[PDB]
């Protein structure tokens with residue numbers, strides 16, 4: 001009970017900031033996560049032994065892929081920690097519990113391929129889950145790990161609290177399907193501007209948590225430029241492998257997945273910032289003003305991609 005995780009001074013300070021990078025020492029990531037649960041949620045939220053066993057089983061079920069890996073999981077959980085810590089009173093006890101777990105689990109057993117590639121390949125998961133294919137799988141894997149002996153970190157919740165937390169996690173994980181973000185953000189945009197947004201309306205909170213999930217998932221664009229740019233290499237390493245696999249099925253991939261079109265990456269990042277990232281962080285900042293640093297970091301990175309196109313780097 002009296003057993004805190006404590007980080008070295010630079011991490012203790014920087015972990016609080018939106019732009020924190022969890023570093024290249026994989027063995028410190030579990031401790032960074034527990035640290036974040038303890039401060040976000042409490043030292044009482046989870047039995048440490050169960051939580052540690054849960055974390056290590058989650059890690060084992062992430063694959064050695066360039067981007068959708070264990071580092072991504074922990075990175076996405078840290079962005080959520082930063083949102084929760086900057087919005088202390090807006091979220092329920094259960095939400096703080098569910099959302100860090102949801103972020104840690106949101107890409108469980110990812111293979112580095114899009115929903116589209118699974119459908120074109122005719123992967124068995126595409127028959128089991130006709131939309132949000134990988135995301136229904138990520139939630140399935142989360143429930144599987146929760147049911148391993150000694151891994152039920154939620155065991156102390158009442159039956160209805162348990163049903164609620166697993167429903168928060170399910171919705172949060174499904175919301176990371178970017179195909180769903182566009183309409184979620186539009187509805188939030190309309191609701192905020194017509195002034196109908198109501199955080200006591202469960203369907204509204206669901207929407208706001210979905211947008212938080214998109215914001216955490218895309219958070220490479222909110223890092224300092226050298227982190228953003230080096231993370232982009234990992235993202236493209238997967239896209240280009242998928243593109244290669246599309247060419248093996250006899251399908252020209254979209255340019256973003258064609259390694260022969262590497263030259264077009266900077267212009268493609270611009271469209272991404274303008275169509276996805278900037279809108280995401282703008283609506284998030286309208287709803288949750290203290291998340292503004294994410295939008296400011298995203299705008300700085302957009303300006304850095306503009307500099308790449310102008311050959312200024």
Ligand SMILES: Cn1cc(-c2ccccc2)nc1COc1nc(N2CCOCC2)c2cnn(C)c2n1
Nearest residue numbers: 178218220221235255256261264265268269271272
């Ligand atoms: C939209 N677009 C078009 C082009 C392009 C490139 C070369 C030639 C021509 C076009 N490049 C993009 C960038 O796509 C993209 N998708 C992301 N998603 C999240 C994780 O997986 C799926 C989706 C993320 C996440 N973080 N970042 C930076 C991302 N960038």
Ligand SMILES: [Mg+2]
Nearest residue numbers: 106107134176
């Ligand atoms: Mg995903």
Ligand SMILES: [Zn+2]
Nearest residue numbers: 106107176217
């Ligand atoms: Zn993700």
